[PDB]
Design an enzyme around this catalytic site. Structure first.
Site, PDB file in Angstrom:
ATOM      1  CE  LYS A   1       6.688   6.764  -2.885  1.00 33.38           C
ATOM      2  NZ  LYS A   1       6.033   7.039  -1.580  1.00 33.38           N
TER       3      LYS A   1
ATOM      4  CG  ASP B   1       1.716   5.002  -7.444  1.00 33.04           C
ATOM      5  OD1 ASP B   1       0.629   5.574  -7.175  1.00 33.04           O
ATOM      6  OD2 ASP B   1       2.042   3.883  -6.983  1.00 33.04           O
TER       7      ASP B   1
ATOM      8  CD  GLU C   1      -0.558  -0.643   3.631  1.00 26.44           C
ATOM      9  OE1 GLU C   1      -1.724  -0.896   4.010  1.00 26.44           O
ATOM     10  OE2 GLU C   1       0.461  -1.165   4.138  1.00 26.44           O
TER      11      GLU C   1
ATOM     12  CE  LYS D   1      -1.606   1.942  -7.722  1.00 22.01           C
ATOM     13  NZ  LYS D   1      -1.200   3.104  -8.568  1.00 22.01           N
TER      14      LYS D   1
ATOM     15  CG  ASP E   1       5.460  10.061  -4.931  1.00 22.87           C
ATOM     16  OD1 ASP E   1       6.471  10.367  -4.236  1.00 22.87           O
ATOM     17  OD2 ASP E   1       4.494   9.417  -4.478  1.00 22.87           O
TER      18      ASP E   1
ATOM     19  N   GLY F   1      -3.862   3.625  -2.516  1.00 21.70           N
ATOM     20  CA  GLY F   1      -4.643   2.398  -2.585  1.00 21.70           C
ATOM     21  C   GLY F   1      -3.851   1.184  -2.098  1.00 21.70           C
TER      22      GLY F   1
ATOM     23  CB  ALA G   1       8.262   2.845  -2.516  1.00 22.39           C
ATOM     24  CG  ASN G   2       6.078   5.325  -6.577  1.00 25.12           C
ATOM     25  OD1 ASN G   2       5.367   4.491  -5.997  1.00 25.12           O
ATOM     26  ND2 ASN G   2       5.845   6.613  -6.473  1.00 25.12           N
TER      27      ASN G   2
HETATM   28  O1  LIG Z   1       3.170  -6.187  -9.497  1.00 24.24           O
HETATM   29  C1  LIG Z   1       3.522  -5.921  -8.314  1.00 24.24           C
HETATM   30  N1  LIG Z   1       4.170  -6.902  -7.563  1.00 24.24           N
HETATM   31  C2  LIG Z   1       4.582  -6.691  -6.220  1.00 24.24           C
HETATM   32  N2  LIG Z   1       5.192  -7.720  -5.515  1.00 24.24           N
HETATM   33  C3  LIG Z   1       5.780  -8.978  -5.901  1.00 24.24           C
HETATM   34  C4  LIG Z   1       5.755 -10.135  -4.912  1.00 24.24           C
HETATM   35  C5  LIG Z   1       7.033  -9.345  -5.127  1.00 24.24           C
HETATM   36  N3  LIG Z   1       4.349  -5.558  -5.641  1.00 24.24           N
HETATM   37  C6  LIG Z   1       3.721  -4.509  -6.269  1.00 24.24           C
HETATM   38  N4  LIG Z   1       3.580  -3.388  -5.427  1.00 24.24           N
HETATM   39  C7  LIG Z   1       3.982  -3.002  -4.064  1.00 24.24           C
HETATM   40  C8  LIG Z   1       4.244  -1.492  -3.952  1.00 24.24           C
HETATM   41  C9  LIG Z   1       4.936  -1.356  -2.597  1.00 24.24           C
HETATM   42  C10 LIG Z   1       5.730  -0.064  -2.351  1.00 24.24           C
HETATM   43  O2  LIG Z   1       4.834   0.920  -1.839  1.00 24.24           O
HETATM   44  C11 LIG Z   1       5.757  -2.631  -2.418  1.00 24.24           C
HETATM   45  O3  LIG Z   1       5.477  -3.196  -1.111  1.00 24.24           O
HETATM   46  C12 LIG Z   1       5.374  -3.505  -3.640  1.00 24.24           C
HETATM   47  O4  LIG Z   1       5.364  -4.873  -3.278  1.00 24.24           O
HETATM   48  C13 LIG Z   1       3.286  -4.611  -7.585  1.00 24.24           C
HETATM   49  C14 LIG Z   1       2.625  -3.484  -8.281  1.00 24.24           C
HETATM   50  N5  LIG Z   1       2.318  -2.293  -7.716  1.00 24.24           N
HETATM   51  C15 LIG Z   1       1.894  -1.360  -8.667  1.00 24.24           C
HETATM   52  C16 LIG Z   1       1.550   0.009  -8.442  1.00 24.24           C
HETATM   53  C17 LIG Z   1       1.252   0.901  -9.526  1.00 24.24           C
HETATM   54  C18 LIG Z   1       1.330   0.422 -10.847  1.00 24.24           C
HETATM   55  C19 LIG Z   1       1.649  -0.970 -11.088  1.00 24.24           C
HETATM   56  C20 LIG Z   1       1.912  -1.841 -10.003  1.00 24.24           C
HETATM   57  S1  LIG Z   1       2.352  -3.540 -10.002  1.00 24.24           S
END
Ligand SMILES: O=c1[nH]c(NC2CC2)nc(N[C@@H]2C[C@H](CO)[C@@H](O)[C@H]2O)c1-c1nc2ccccc2s1
Length: 290
Positions: free
Chosen positions: A147, A163, A33, A52, A145, A37, A149-150
């Site tokens: 970063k 994002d 998260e 998401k 944004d 979202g 995490a993105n």
């Molecule tokens: O396809 C994905 N796979 C995994 N994990 C796999 C098992 C390893 N994590 C995601 N997001 C999380 C975002 C977060 C950081 O805030 C982390 O904790 C990530 O794990 C996405 C997507 N997240 C998004 C977000 C926006 C657009 C496309 C996608 S695809």
């Protein structure tokens, strides 16, 4: 110039085991998260996906529509791929191609026992993320944004920018009363309300220092608390970049590390106009490998 599949809310709810808040280790579907979202794992139309579920109720819808608009225009190998959305049910949904290796943040912190990233992988990720930012800038988009995490990682550890909810078009320097982003990555002008691609470059500089160091942008229990401050410790000659290099690497050579640091240092110039543009950042990162 890209049309998307319209998914049923109940097809998404079904495949994500009724949007389970539990992690993948126990038996849930929640991947994370923060992007206004919650991201869940799912299996739809013979492919593994990321769903998401968004999450003012009107401000969240704006973050939903802008993401679709930016993704309809912006298709690149270093950007996340949107497959479709959902508007029919209770909550708004965005369906993307699944990123098995999660985020750069999680892989730099070796979250859940994943092995540290080699310097060779890190150079590829930095180049990939720079190619993604270049694509957005060439197409007159400001991410707002950038970063770790993105920056998401696929099957091959290819960097994919995610994002685009806060993204803005160009195609200056605009101003805003709604200051959005992550403070620890934000340029001085961006914290003051300015909207410029030059701020994306600054944030990218913080990301490069994360790649070199393996340290998070902000740590409450650390000196300095903000990673960007290390630039000053190195400039004042109190410390060197070699003292900051992630010890969780066996393949990092001094020449390429210093070459990446030089780029991060240039990106982190406090004066927006003194910063290199993305094309220069891209060139320098390519010259580093090479
Ligand atoms: O396809 C994905 N796979 C995994 N994990 C796999 C098992 C390893 N994590 C995601 N997001 C999380 C975002 C977060 C950081 O805030 C982390 O904790 C990530 O794990 C996405 C997507 N997240 C998004 C977000 C926006 C657009 C496309 C996608 S695809």
């Amino acid at each position: 110039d890209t049309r998307f599949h319209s998914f049923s809310f109940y097809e998404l709810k079904n495949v994500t085991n009724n949007f389970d808040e539990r992690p993948i280790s126990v038996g849930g579907n929640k991947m994370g998260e923060g992007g206004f979202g919650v991201v869940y794992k799912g299996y739809v139309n013979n492919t593994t996906v990321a769903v998401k579920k968004l999450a003012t109720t009107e401000e969240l819808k704006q973050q939903f529509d802008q993401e679709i608009k930016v993704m309809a225009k912006c298709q690149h190998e270093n950007l996340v791929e949107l497959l479709g959305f959902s508007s029919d049910g209770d909550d708004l949904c965005l369906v993307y191609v699944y990123m098995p290796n999660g985020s750069l943040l999680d892989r730099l912190s070796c979250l859940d026992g994943t092995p540290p990233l080699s310097w060779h992988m890190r150079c590829k990720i930095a180049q990939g993320a720079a190619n993604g930012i270049n694509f957005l800038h060439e197409n007159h988009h400001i991410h707002r944004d950038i970063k770790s995490a993105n920056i998401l990682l696929d099957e091959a550890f290819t960097a994919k920018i995610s994002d685009f909810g806060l993204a803005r078009a160009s195609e200056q320097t605009v101003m805003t009363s709604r200051i959005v982003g992550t403070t620890a990555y934000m340029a001085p002008e961006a914290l003051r309300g300015e909207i410029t691609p030059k701020s994306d470059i600054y944030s990218f500089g913080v990301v490069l220092l994360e790649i070199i160091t393996g340290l998070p942008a902000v740590d409450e229990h650390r000196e300095p608390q903000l990673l960007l401050d290390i630039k000053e410790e190195i400039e004042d000659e109190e410390k060197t970049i070699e003292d900051y290099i992630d010890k969780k690497m066996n393949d990092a050579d001094s020449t390429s590390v210093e070459a990446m640091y030089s780029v991060a240092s240039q990106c982190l110039h406090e004066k927006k106009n003194k910063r290199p543009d993305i094309k220069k950042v891209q060139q320098l990162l390519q010259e580093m490998t090479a």
